[PDB]
Design a protein around this ligand. Structure first.
Ligand SMILES: Nc1ncnc2c1ncn2[C@@H]1O[C@H](COP(=O)(O)OP(=O)(O)NP(=O)(O)O)[C@@H](O)[C@H]1O
Ligand SMILES: Nc1ncnc2c1ncn2[C@@H]1O[C@H](COP(=O)(O)OP(=O)(O)NP(=O)(O)O)[C@@H](O)[C@H]1O
Lengths: 391, 391
C-alpha cells in the first residue's frame, strides 16, 4: 500500500495530505499552521510547535507518519508550487536543475516561492530515497498564445522583466476539465469548456481542445474576478487617482487590493459568502451588492473567455463557492441567458454530496455542471505517472 | 439659416464645427491648436495665434464666423464635456448652477474639466444672448446598475471619493445605438446591442432596451480595451511589481500606461493602425502581435459585455478604426464564432464612403454593422431639442 505525500507549503502554513496510490483516497490530512505559536493539526490532536521553521513543521509531520507506520509506504512526494513562470509547462521530477529553475522564478512571487522551496528542502531532507515531484499552479496556462498573455505595456516590460499573464488555479482547471470530458461525454480534442473556479481565490479558464487558451488571473492572483478579499480588475487610473487623493503609496494600495477588498471590502462584513448570503437574506443591502457585483464580474469573464473557444460545449463550476453555492451558480447562469443557458433548478439545489453533476435542463444550449475540484489528487496522479520514469 | 456652434475644448486644442440646424450638415470646421506657438486651422488658412489662452483662440474663432457673416445665425452653442460624474444623466442648458456642478467634478479629471470650463467661460463671453448646452461623455452610462459600476475596493472609496466606473464615448455610443435601431429595424425597447467604438481611444458598450448597461472604460479612460497608446486592463499586482522592480512611482507608471503603451508600446513602432497593418504586411512580428492582442481584447470585451443583455441582436462598429479597418473588423468577428457570427466579406470590404452598412451574411446569428459616429451631430441634436425649452 504505497502512498503519496502531498505538500503545499505556503507563507503561513503547510497543508498536507497522504493519498493511497491505489485509489487516490485521502488517508490522512492536516496542517502545520501559524508558521510565534506554530501548531500541528491532523484533521484530532491540535498539537503545538511554537517558533517552528518549515523544516521543523515537516519533521513533525514526518514523525506523525512514522507514528502510524506510514513512513515506509511513502513512495512519492508531490509539492504544490505557486509559480513556475515560463519555465514549467508540466509537472516534473524534482532534481537540482528543477530547484535552480524554481529559484529563478523567485522574483515573480518572492515569499510564496521561498515557502515552496523551503518545503522542497525540508522534504528532501526527510525523504532522500523518495522520488519527489513539483506541480505548478501556472503550468496549465502555458499554452496561452501571446495575444492572450500580453499586457498592453511597452514590449520591454515583457521581454526584459517577464511581465505577462501567467494565471493560477492551473492544477484545478486541468483536473476539472479532464473530469468534464467524461461527465459531459465530450471528445477532448474537439471541445470548448469554461471552468469557473470559485473559492476565496477565484478565476475563469477557457479550455479549447484540452488546452488552456485564456484565464482571468494575471501576472499575479489579483487580476480578473472580484474575490473574497481581492478587488479583481481595477482601473489603474482609478488606483493612481486614489493614491494622489489619499497620499497612499503603491504598497499601501497593494495591501488594500489584496486584503481589504472584494466581498469583504464592498460588504463591510465578511469575505465569507455564507455569511453574506445570510446577511442579504436579512436585508443587508451592501451584502447583496457585494454578491451581485461578484456575480456580475463572473458572468462578464465567463462570456469573455468564451470568445477564445470555437464552440462552447460546457460551463463547469468548482471550488468552495462553485461547488456549494446554489444561489451564486443560479444568479451566474441567469446572467448568461444570452448564451442560451437553461438551469434545472432542482438539479442546482442538490448539495455537493452529489459530486460530479449536471445542473442545466435539456433545452440548454450549453451544458452546465458542477465538478468538485481535487488538487491533491491531481498532484498525486502526476506523481504516480512520474513514478514510472527512469531519472 | 440658424446654425449650432459645437465646441470641444480640450487640454491642447479647441475643435469646433458649425452645423446647419436644418440638415445638421457641417458648414465649417476647424481647430485652434498648440494651446507656445498656438494656431487656428479652419479645414485653408493655417493661421497663427502664439501664447493664446482659451478665450483668445475662441475670440479668434468668433471673428472668423463674424468674417463669414455667421455670427447672427448662431442660435445655439454645444459644449462637449469630458466628465459629468454622477451629476449629469442627460445634456443640459448651461446656467450658473450647471457651471457650479461641472466644477464639483473637477477632481475626477482636473485638466480636462478645466479646459471644458475654460471653453464655457470663453463662449459665454463671446455669445451672451445665445443659449448654450453641455453634453457629457459620461452621461449615457449613468443608467449602469451598481453591480456593473462598482469596483471591488473598500466601500469607502465609492461612498466618500466617488470611485466607480463612469465610462466614456457616451455621446458616440448613444448616437450609434440610435442609428442602429433604424438600420437594423429593431424595436428600441426590446433590443440588445454591443457598440464598439474603436478609435485612438476605444471602448465597448452594451445597450439593452436603449440604455447603457455596461461599458469598458472605467473611472478613467484607461480601463478596458487596449488602445493606441493606452494599456487597457492591466493587473494592479503587475503594476505594483513593476514599481518595486524599476523604482518608478505611480505617477511614472501612469504616464507609461496612458502615453507609451498599447499599440505603440507593443509594436515599438506606432499607435496608428494603418502604419501597423502595413508593417505586418511587411513581416513585422511585433506589429502583428500588437494587432492580434488588440483584436483579442476587443473580442473578449465584446462577448463579456454581451452578458448584460437578455438577447444579442447586433454588434456595431464605429470610430476611426471601426469604420475604416476592414482587417480589424474581420479578425474581431472571426474571434466571435462562438456567438454565431457570419461575416459577408464583400460587404466588409466596402470603404466607409458606404456609410451605415450591414456586414454580416444572412445565416449570422447576430447582425453586424458599421455605423459612422458623429458626436458633433449628436450634440447639435441635443442643442436643438433643448432650443425649444423655456429656461
Ligand atoms: N455551503 C456554502 N455556500 C456558499 N459558499 C460556501 C459554502 N461552503 C464554502 N463556501 C465558500 O467557499 C469559499 C472558500 O472556498 P475555498 O475552500 O477557498 O475553495 P478553493 O477550492 O480552496 N479555492 P482557493 O481558495 O483559491 O484555493 C468561502 O466563501 C466559503 O464561504
Ligand atoms: N483607413 C484606416 N484603416 C485603419 N485604421 C484607420 C483608418 N483611418 C483611420 N484609422 C485609425 O483610426 C484611429 C484614429 O481614430 P479616431 O479618429 O480617433 O476615431 P474617434 O472617432 O476619434 N475615437 P477617439 O479617438 O477616442 O475620439 C487611428 O489608428 C487611425 O489609424
Amino acid at each position: 500500500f504505497p502512498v503519496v505525500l502531498v505538500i503545499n507549503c505556503g507563507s503561513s502554513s503547510i497543508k498536507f495530505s497522504v493519498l493511497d496510490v491505489a485509489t487516490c483516497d485521502v488517508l490522512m490530512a492536516g496542517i502545520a499552521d501559524g508558521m510565534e505559536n506554530a501548531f500541528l493539526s491532523i484533521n484530532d490532536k491540535p498539537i503545538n510547535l511554537a517558533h517552528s521553521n518549515y523544516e521543523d513543521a515537516l519533521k513533525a509531520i514526518a514523525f506523525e507518519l512514522e507514528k502510524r507506520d506510514l513512513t515506509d509506504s511513502v513512495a512519492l512526494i508531490g509539492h504544490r508550487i505557486g509559480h513556475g513562470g515560463e519555465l514549467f509547462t508540466q509537472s516534473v521530477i524534482i532534481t537540482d536543475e528543477i530547484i535552480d529553475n524554481i529559484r529563478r522564478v523567485s522574483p515573480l512571487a518572492p515569499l510564496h516561492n521561498y515557502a515552496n522551496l523551503s518545503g522542497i528542502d525540508a522534504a528532501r531532507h526527510l525523504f532522500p530515497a523518495v522520488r519527489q515531484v513539483a506541480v505548478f499552479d501556472t503550468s496549465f496556462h502555458q499554452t496561452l498564445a501571446p495575444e492572450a498573455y500580453l499586457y498592453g505595456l511597452p514590449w520591454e516590460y515583457f521581454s526584459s522583466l517577464g511581465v505577462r499573464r501567467y494565471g493560477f488555479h492551473g492544477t484545478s482547471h486541468r483536473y476539472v476539465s479532464r473530469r468534464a470530458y467524461e461527465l459531459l461525454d465530450l471528445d477532448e480534442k474537439d471541445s470548448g469548456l469554461i471552468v469557473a473556479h470559485l473559492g476565496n481565490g477565484a478565476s475563469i479558464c477557457a479550455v479549447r481542445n484540452g488546452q488552456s487558451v485564456d484565464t482571468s488571473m494575471g501576472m499575479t492572483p489579483l487580476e480578473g474576478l472580484m474575490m473574497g478579499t481581492r478587488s479583481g480588475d481595477v482601473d489603474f487610473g482609478a488606483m493612481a487617482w486614489i493614491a494622489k487623493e489619499t497620499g497612499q503609496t503603491l504598497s499601501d494600495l497593494e495591501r488594500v487590493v489584496n486584503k481589504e477588498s472584494g466581498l469583504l471590502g464592498i460588504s463591510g462584513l465578511s469575505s465569507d459568502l455564507r455569511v453574506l448570503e445570510k446577511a442579504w437574506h436579512e436585508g443587508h443591502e451592501r451584502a447583496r451588492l457585494a454578491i451581485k457585483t461578484f456575480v456580475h464580474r463572473i458572468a462578464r469573464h465567463i462570456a469573455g473567455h468564451a470568445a477564445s473557444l470555437h464552440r462552447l460545449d460546457g460551463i463547469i463550476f468548482t471550488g468552495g463557492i462553485g461547488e456549494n453555492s446554489v444561489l451564486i451558480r443560479q444568479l451566474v447562469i441567469e446572467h448568461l441567458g444570452v448564451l442560451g443557458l437553461t438551469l434545472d433548478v432542482e438539479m442546482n439545489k442538490q448539495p455537493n454530496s452529489h459530486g460530479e453533476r449536471i445542473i442545466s435542463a435539456n433545452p440548454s444550449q450549453v451544458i452546465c455542471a458542477v465538478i468538485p475540484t481535487n488538487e491533491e489528487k491531481m498532484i498525486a496522479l502526476d506523481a504516480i505517472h512520474l513514478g514510472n520514469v527512469k531519472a
